[PDB]
């Protein structure tokens, strides 16, 4: 197209290995940060507990509940509870879900995130369903029950940002690497006998040209190419973590622009 340049190498439901040409270091960084802490998501953020005769403590459970990845695809049409005009929560701003588990068997009864049951009105929005990449279809092991054990509780999922708690973090890992031959001398390699024989070769070295000893130091050069890999938990597909990331960053750059106009008034 025009400026910054993308080149997928590998793609999957869970990962996007790509190359981000023609961008400032600053921008390629600021994007990774945003991808980590600032694309919003839905995640359980309140647990009212009715009965817990389980081996685990109330809040100890409540905690894990927060960590269970809930579908956040249509998240942009759910609201921040702090924003929405209702008192406490509602259907515009919060999914509510139910968990019932009782040990019937002699054998240990497990409780998975499949056992989570949406209850509030999704009203069409693609939201709140626990992500399940598990192979036998019960992602995440909430808790374990003995024979007479019961656990009955209700969770209100809210829209949140990973800055506020790492539960609402859409990104898992975000691999990131530039200049794989130190042609910019951005590190000084620690060594014992030989930098080259001791430090292993980055996989991103088949992609650049090795320097020549017949060449001197290129001092004018800048950091240009960037080798990232975004891995997603699943509450948002991969492609979207990067996109919404670019979207959010851009979005917040913007409110700064607007804020400058707000001040100009007399």
């Amino acid at each position: 197209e025009e400026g910054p340049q993308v080149k997928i190498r590998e793609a999957s439901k869970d990962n996007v290995d790509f190359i981000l040409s023609n961008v400032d270091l600053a921008m390629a960084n600021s994007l990774r940060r945003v991808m980590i802490a600032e694309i919003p998501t839905l995640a359980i953020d309140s647990v009212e507990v009715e009965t817990n005769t389980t081996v685990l403590a109330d809040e100890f459970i409540a905690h894990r509940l927060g960590l269970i990845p809930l579908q956040s695809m249509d998240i942009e049409q759910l609201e921040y509870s702090r924003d929405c005009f209702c008192e406490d929560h509602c259907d515009k701003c919060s999914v509510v879900l139910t968990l019932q588990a009782f040990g019937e068997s002699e054998s240990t009864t497990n409780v998975y995130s499949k056992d989570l049951v949406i209850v509030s009105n999704l009203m069409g929005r693609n939201i709140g369903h626990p992500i399940i990449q598990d192979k036998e279809g019960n992602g995440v092991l909430i808790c374990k029950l003995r024979k007479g054990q019961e656990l009955k509780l209700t969770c209100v999922a809210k829209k949140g940002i990973a800055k506020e708690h790492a539960k609402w973090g859409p990104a898992a890992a975000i691999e990131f690497e530039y200049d794989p031959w130190n042609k910019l001398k951005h590190t000084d390699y620690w060594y014992e006998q030989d930098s080259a024989k001791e430090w292993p070769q980055s996989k991103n070295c088949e992609y650049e040209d090795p320097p020549n000893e017949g060449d001197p130091f290129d001092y004018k050069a800048q950091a240009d190419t960037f080798y990232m890999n975004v891995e997603s938990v699943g509450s948002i597909p991969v492609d979207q973590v990067v996109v919404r990331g670019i979207d959010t960053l851009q979005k917040k750059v913007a409110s700064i622009l607007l804020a400058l106009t707000q001040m100009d008034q007399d």
């Binding site: 910054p4 793609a11 600021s30 913007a254 804020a259």
Partner: protein, 114 residues
């Protein structure tokens, strides 16, 4: 027990403007904007792009304490060029690269498999 709430990193408070502009008293034609509820995510991006504008004499940001989500941007421009415009062109410039980045990524994504 003495911890601040975590929303306090992105939610503004009781009468805290997002930007605050002050005339730098040291050097002429220079300004120092305070960005409440922001961090290196923003600051490093604005300052690095302000460095490409060839009528910007000076540009640097700083988080005076990590406890607080806020940072100071200091900008000096050549005579006649008001620094706010240097900020404005700067932001916009970023927004345009970001947009191009998004579409360029999309088309690339729409060509893949698995």
């Amino acid at each position: 027990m003495n911890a601040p709430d975590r929303f306090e990193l992105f939610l503004l408070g009781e009468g805290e403007s997002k930007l605050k502009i002050d005339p730098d008293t040291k050097a002429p034609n220079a300004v120092v904007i305070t960005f409440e509820k922001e961090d290196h995510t923003l600051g490093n991006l604005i300052r690095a792009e302000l460095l490409n504008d060839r009528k910007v004499l000076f540009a640097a940001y700083k988080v005076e304490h990590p406890f607080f989500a806020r940072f100071k941007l200091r900008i000096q421009t050549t005579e006649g060029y008001d620094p706010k415009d240097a900020l404005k062109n700067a932001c916009n410039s970023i927004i345009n690269k970001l947009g191009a980045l998004k579409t360029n990524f999309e088309t690339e994504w729409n060509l893949q498999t698995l």
